[PDB]
Write a protein that holds these residues in place. Structure first.
Motif, short mmCIF file in Angstrom:
data_model
loop_
_atom_site.label_atom_id
_atom_site.label_comp_id
_atom_site.label_asym_id
_atom_site.label_seq_id
_atom_site.Cartn_x
_atom_site.Cartn_y
_atom_site.Cartn_z
N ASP A 1 -32.75 -16.76 4.07
CA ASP A 1 -33.11 -16.28 2.70
C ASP A 1 -34.25 -17.09 2.09
O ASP A 1 -34.05 -18.23 1.65
CB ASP A 1 -31.89 -16.29 1.77
CG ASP A 1 -31.02 -15.07 1.94
OD1 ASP A 1 -30.87 -14.60 3.08
OD2 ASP A 1 -30.49 -14.58 0.92
N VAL A 3 -36.86 -18.36 -0.54
CA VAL A 3 -36.77 -18.62 -1.98
C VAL A 3 -38.17 -18.59 -2.59
O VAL A 3 -39.08 -19.29 -2.14
CB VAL A 3 -36.12 -19.99 -2.27
CG1 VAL A 3 -35.69 -20.09 -3.73
CG2 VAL A 3 -34.92 -20.23 -1.35
N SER A 99 -39.18 -10.54 5.40
CA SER A 99 -37.85 -10.49 5.98
C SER A 99 -36.79 -10.15 4.93
O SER A 99 -36.63 -10.88 3.95
CB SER A 99 -37.51 -11.83 6.65
OG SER A 99 -37.56 -12.89 5.71
N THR A 100 -36.09 -9.04 5.15
CA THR A 100 -34.93 -8.67 4.33
C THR A 100 -33.86 -9.77 4.50
O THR A 100 -33.57 -10.17 5.63
CB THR A 100 -34.37 -7.28 4.73
OG1 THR A 100 -33.88 -7.33 6.07
CG2 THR A 100 -35.45 -6.19 4.62
N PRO A 101 -33.27 -10.25 3.40
CA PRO A 101 -33.32 -9.76 2.01
C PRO A 101 -34.65 -9.99 1.29
O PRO A 101 -35.16 -11.12 1.29
CB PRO A 101 -32.22 -10.58 1.33
CG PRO A 101 -32.20 -11.87 2.07
CD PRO A 101 -32.56 -11.54 3.49
N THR A 103 -36.82 -10.81 -1.72
CA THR A 103 -36.48 -11.81 -2.73
C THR A 103 -37.60 -11.93 -3.77
O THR A 103 -38.78 -11.78 -3.45
CB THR A 103 -36.21 -13.18 -2.07
OG1 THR A 103 -37.28 -13.50 -1.17
CG2 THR A 103 -34.90 -13.13 -1.28
N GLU B 43 -33.07 -8.49 -8.64
CA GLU B 43 -32.18 -8.79 -7.53
C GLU B 43 -32.04 -7.58 -6.60
O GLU B 43 -31.46 -6.55 -6.96
CB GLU B 43 -30.81 -9.27 -8.03
CG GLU B 43 -29.75 -9.44 -6.94
CD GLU B 43 -28.51 -10.16 -7.43
OE1 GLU B 43 -28.62 -11.36 -7.77
OE2 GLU B 43 -27.42 -9.54 -7.45
N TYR B 55 -28.93 -2.93 5.63
CA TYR B 55 -28.68 -4.34 5.32
C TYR B 55 -28.29 -4.51 3.85
O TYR B 55 -28.57 -3.62 3.03
CB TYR B 55 -29.90 -5.20 5.66
CG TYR B 55 -29.99 -5.62 7.12
CD1 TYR B 55 -30.53 -4.77 8.08
CD2 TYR B 55 -29.54 -6.88 7.53
CE1 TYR B 55 -30.61 -5.15 9.41
CE2 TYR B 55 -29.62 -7.27 8.85
CZ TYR B 55 -30.16 -6.41 9.79
OH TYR B 55 -30.23 -6.81 11.11
N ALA B 57 -27.40 -7.56 0.41
CA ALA B 57 -27.44 -8.91 -0.13
C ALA B 57 -26.04 -9.52 -0.06
O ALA B 57 -25.04 -8.81 -0.18
CB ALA B 57 -27.94 -8.90 -1.56
N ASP B 58 -25.98 -10.84 0.14
CA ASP B 58 -24.71 -11.58 0.21
C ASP B 58 -23.63 -11.01 -0.71
O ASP B 58 -22.57 -10.59 -0.25
CB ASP B 58 -24.94 -13.07 -0.13
CG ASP B 58 -24.99 -13.97 1.12
OD1 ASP B 58 -25.11 -13.45 2.25
OD2 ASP B 58 -24.92 -15.20 0.95
#
Lengths: 219, 209
Positions: A1, A3, A99-101, A103, B43, B55, B57-58
């Motif tokens: 993930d 940032v 890259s997914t996710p 952000t 988000e 896919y 998100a957490d």
């Protein structure tokens, strides 16, 4: 993930002048296969969905002014708004799509800067039909001022108030760049029916001395 | 992309958000959901590829399930076991490519996760030389939002509609104010048009001096 951190959080610059916003990613978004960075910049006006301004890091989307431009490569990026128009007041975000996710940064507010303007102050006693339902709301309007910071003190029988008031500020006006504030004093009918003098006192950079607007219960 | 479905819902409850993608073909594109909590940042939630892979998100994996069947242009997000942290405006984001995640949007749909029942506002008047001010106090409503217009959208100059303040009772309150000339008080009519859709409430108030 990955940032995305944005710097700064807040920003205000004068018209026609230059605002700049930064964005840093924890990993490079430069894809070697095409050598086009996987980063985007968005503009979000109040109550509106974000609008894409810049894709692949430095390419203006169609229908977007020449004044916005994106720069940088890999991890460190910059959005530059030269000639900040009236229509350019909003929040700006950076987003990676390597890259997914996917952000985002936390956003950067871009205010317009102008000369000090003083609030015009108005006071309204509670309406008769609210007094029917068992409550009194004393409203105080601060209309069209700049900068946003303003002190409103409620005084009841010249006795100060704490805890029993709230306020909200309109977003920076997009025409004259000012702000407005509403302040509501909330009391029960029983507690409202006790005191005589209801005063709203306003302190602001564009007032040389504090301004009071008052009414005597009744009148 | 006209986002629809959102409204008041209980915790542990469930909702499905619909998305009329009239403008370009749903199947011809890659589609997504991105949420924005009131006052907060953006988000990313979920992705459904034009191929079919998915896919998450957490914080939404398992609880959320994205779905799409090419009917009359529509995308869906199925939300189950809803927590209060899921309170947000939800947006449909159209891609422009496979890996091409330049996001394109519509207007968004508001989801409030609250056990509370809907409450409609009460509308009180703010009563009114150079310039006189007047307005409407739209008190004690739940949930957001309320819209206020003046003279059915004819009066827009001088109109300030303040963001809602969450009170100690937990119900919302806002005010809408207008500046007008003093000389045109006992001749011109001023009505605020208050709309609180979550409780199907519509109020129109004469503001007299």
């Amino acid at each position: 993930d990955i940032v995305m951190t944005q710097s700064p959080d807040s920003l205000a610059v004068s018209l026609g002048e230059r605002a700049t916003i930064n964005c840093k990613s924890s990993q490079s978004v430069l894809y070697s296969s095409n050598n086009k960075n996987y980063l985007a910049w968005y503009q979000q006006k109040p109550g509106q969905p974000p609008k894409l301004l810049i894709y692949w890091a430095s390419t203006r989307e169609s229908g977007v002014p020449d004044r916005f431009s994106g720069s940088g490569s890999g991890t460190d990026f910059t959005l530059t708004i030269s000639s900040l128009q009236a229509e350019d007041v909003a929040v700006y975000y950076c987003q990676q799509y390597y890259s997914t996710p996917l952000t985002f940064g936390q956003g950067t507010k871009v205010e317009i800067k102008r000369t000090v303007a003083a609030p015009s102050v108005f006071i309204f006693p509670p309406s008769d039909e609210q007094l029917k339902s068992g409550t009194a709301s004393v409203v105080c309007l601060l209309n069209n001022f700049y900068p946003r910071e303003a002190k409103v003190q409620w005084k009841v029988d010249n006795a100060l108030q704490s805890g029993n008031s709230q306020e909200s500020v309109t977003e920076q006006d997009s025409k004259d760049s000012t702000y407005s504030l509403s302040s509501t004093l909330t009391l029960s009918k029983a507690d409202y029916e006790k005191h005589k003098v209801y005063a709203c006192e306003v302190t602001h950079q564009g007032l040389s001395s504090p301004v009071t607007k008052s009414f005597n219960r009744g009148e | 992309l006209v986002e629809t479905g959102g409204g008041l819902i209980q915790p542990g409850g469930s909702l499905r958000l619909s998305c009329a993608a009239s403008g370009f073909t749903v199947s011809s594109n890659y589609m997504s959901w991105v949420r924005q909590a009131p006052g907060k940042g953006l988000e990313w939630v979920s992705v459904i590829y034009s191929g079919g892979s998915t896919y998450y998100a957490d914080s939404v994996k398992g609880r959320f399930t994205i779905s799409r069947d090419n009917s009359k242009n529509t995308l869906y997000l199925q939300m189950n076991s809803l927590r209060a942290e899921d309170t947000a405006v939800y947006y449909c984001a159209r891609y422009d490519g496979i890996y091409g995640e330049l996001d394109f949007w519509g207007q968004g749909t508001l989801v409030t996760v609250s056990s509370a029942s809907t409450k409609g506002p009460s509308v009180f008047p703010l009563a009114p030389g150079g310039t006189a001010a007047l307005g409407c106090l739209v008190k004690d409503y739940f949930p957001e939002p309320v819209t206020v217009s003046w003279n059915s959208g004819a009066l827009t100059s001088g109109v300030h509609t303040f963001p809602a303040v969450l009170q100690s009772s937990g119900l919302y309150s806002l005010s809408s104010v207008v500046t007008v000339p003093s000389s045109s008080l006992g001749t011109q009519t001023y009505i605020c048009n208050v709309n609180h859709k979550p409780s199907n409430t519509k109020v129109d108030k004469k503001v007299e001096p």
